[PDB]
C-alpha cells in the first residue's frame, strides 16, 4: 500500500501541490494526507504525486518570506539530521530550501503526473 | 483612512485544527473579518478573534517548531534574527537552541490563547 509514503499533494482549488505524507487509505480513490505543517485532510489519488524527493531538474516553486511564486529548478538534494533540503537554482544562483518550502503549481505538478501520479 | 492592520504580519488560526500559522493581512473584508495570506500562499478569510498581531512572536513564548517528521515539538522563543529579508526564531527545546524560519513556527490553540489578551484582534 501507499500508506506511509512521502508525497506532494494538492488539497484545494488553488491547485498547488504541497509536501506531505499518506497516512491512511480512506477508500473511494482517496487518501488521508498529513501535510508537513500538520494539517491533515482527505485528498484524491489523482492529486498526489509520489515524489520523495522531487527529482533533479524539476521546475518548482520555492517559498521564502514574502515570496509566493518564485520559480526555480532542483539542482541538488541533501539529507542532514533527518531532514531533506533542496538546492534550488534561479538566475544562476543556488539556495537551500527545506522540504516543506518546496511546492509545485498545477502546471509544474502536471509535468510529473505521467511518471509519479498516484491516480 | 484605512484599517490599521492591513499589510501587517500576524499568526492566524486554521479552523480545522485550531493551530495558528504565520501569515499576513492583505485586507479588511468587513464583518470583523480579514483576508489572510498564509506563508504557503493559501488565502482565505479569517475572523479577527482568530488573529494574533505578533511580528515577531515574543521572547519566552511557548511555540510549536516544525521540522521534518515533527508536528508537535514544543519549544520556547529565546531570540530573533533577520537576514536578507527573512526572520528566524531561536527556539530552545530541552538542551539545544536551534534556528527556525518564521513559517516553521506555529502555535497550538492553547499556545495561541496565551497571547490572545495582549496580541489578539
Ligand atoms: C493553510 C495551511 C494550514 C497554512 N496550510 C495547508 C497545508 C499545506 N501547507 C503546508 O504544508 C505549508 C507549507 C509551507 C508553509 C506553511 Br505556513 C504551510
From Swiss-Prot, chain B:
Location of the region described as Tudor-like in the Swiss-Prot/TrEMBL record: 3-121
Disulfide bonds, paired cysteine numbers: none
Segments of this protein annotated with the region Interaction with dimethylated histone H4: 14-42
Protein modification: Asymmetrically dimethylated on Arg residues by PRMT1. Methylation is required for DNA binding.
Mutation effect (residue 40 to A): Loss of interaction with histone H4 that has been dimethylated at 'Lys-20' (H4K20me2). Abolishes recruitment to double strand breaks. Loss of interaction with histone H4 that has been dimethylated at 'Lys-20' (H4K20me2)
Annotated consequence of substituting residue 21 to L/Q: Abolishes recruitment to double strand breaks
Record's subcellular location: Nucleus; Chromosome; Chromosome, Centromere, Kinetochore
Chain residue numbers at which the record places covalent cross-link Glycyl lysine isopeptide (Lys-Gly) (interchain with G-Cter in SUMO2): 82
Effect of residue 42 to S: Decreases affinity for histone H4 that has been dimethylated at 'Lys-20'
Effect of residue 14 to A/H: Loss of interaction with histone H4 that has been dimethylated at 'Lys-20' (H4K20me2). Abolishes recruitment to double strand breaks. Loss of interaction with histone H4 that has been dimethylated at 'Lys-20' (H4K20me2)
Effect annotated for changing residue 82 to R: Does not affect monoubiquitination by MSL2
Involvement in disease: A chromosomal aberration involving TP53BP1 is found in a form of myeloproliferative disorder chronic with eosinophilia. Translocation t(5;15)(q33;q22) with PDGFRB creating a TP53BP1-PDGFRB fusion protein.
Domain notes: The Tudor-like region mediates binding to histone H4 dimethylated at 'Lys-20' (H4K20me2). Interaction with NUDT16L1/TIRR masks the Tudor-like domain and prevents recruitment to chromatin. The UDR (ubiquitin-dependent recruitment) motif specifically recognizes and binds histone H2A monoubiquitinated at 'Lys-15' (H2AK15ub). Phosphorylation of the UDR blocks interaction with H2AK15ub.
Protein task: Double-strand break (DSB) repair protein involved in response to DNA damage, telomere dynamics and class-switch recombination (CSR) during antibody genesis. Plays a key role in the repair of double-strand DNA breaks (DSBs) in response to DNA damage by promoting non-homologous end joining (NHEJ)-mediated repair of DSBs and specifically counteracting the function of the homologous recombination (HR) repair protein BRCA1. In response to DSBs, phosphorylation by ATM promotes interaction with RIF1 and dissociation from NUDT16L1/TIRR, leading to recruitment to DSBs sites.
Subunit structure, as described in the record: Homoligomer. Interacts with p53/TP53 (via the central domain). Interacts with DCLRE1C. Interacts with histone H2AX and this requires phosphorylation of H2AX on 'Ser-139'. Interacts with histone H4 that has been dimethylated at 'Lys-20' (H4K20me2). Has low affinity for histone H4 containing monomethylated 'Lys-20' (H4K20me1). Does not bind histone H4 containing unmethylated or trimethylated 'Lys-20' (H4K20me3). Has low affinity for histone H3 that has been dimethylated on 'Lys-79'. Has very low affinity for histone H3 that has been monomethylated on 'Lys-79' (in vitro). (Microbial infection) Interacts (via C-terminus) with Epstein-Barr virus lytic switch protein BZLF1 (via C-terminus); this interaction is involved in the activation of the viral lytic cycle.
Name the record gives this protein: TP53-binding protein 1
From-to range in the entire protein, with total length: 1483 to 1602 of 1972
Amino acid at each position: 500500500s501507499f500508506v506511509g509514503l512521502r508525497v506532494v499533494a494538492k488539497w484545494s482549488s488553488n491547485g498547488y501541490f504541497y509536501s506531505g505524507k499518506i497516512t491512511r487509505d480512506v477508500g473511494a480513490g482517496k487518501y488521508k494526507l498529513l501535510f508537513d505543517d500538520g494539517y491533515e485532510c482527505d485528498v484524491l489519488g489523482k492529486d498526489i504525486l509520489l515524489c520523495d524527493p522531487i527529482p533533479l531538474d524539476t521546475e518548482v516553486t520555492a517559498l521564502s518570506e514574502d515570496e509566493y511564486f518564485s520559480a526555480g529548478v532542483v539542482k541538488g538534494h541533501r539529507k542532514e539530521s533527518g531532514e531533506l533540503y533542496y538546492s534550488i537554482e534561479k538566475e544562476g544562483q543556488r539556495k537551500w530550501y527545506k522540504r516543506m518550502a518546496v511546492i509545485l503549481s498545477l502546471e509544474q505538478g502536471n509535468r510529473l503526473r505521467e511518471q509519479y501520479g498516484l491516480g
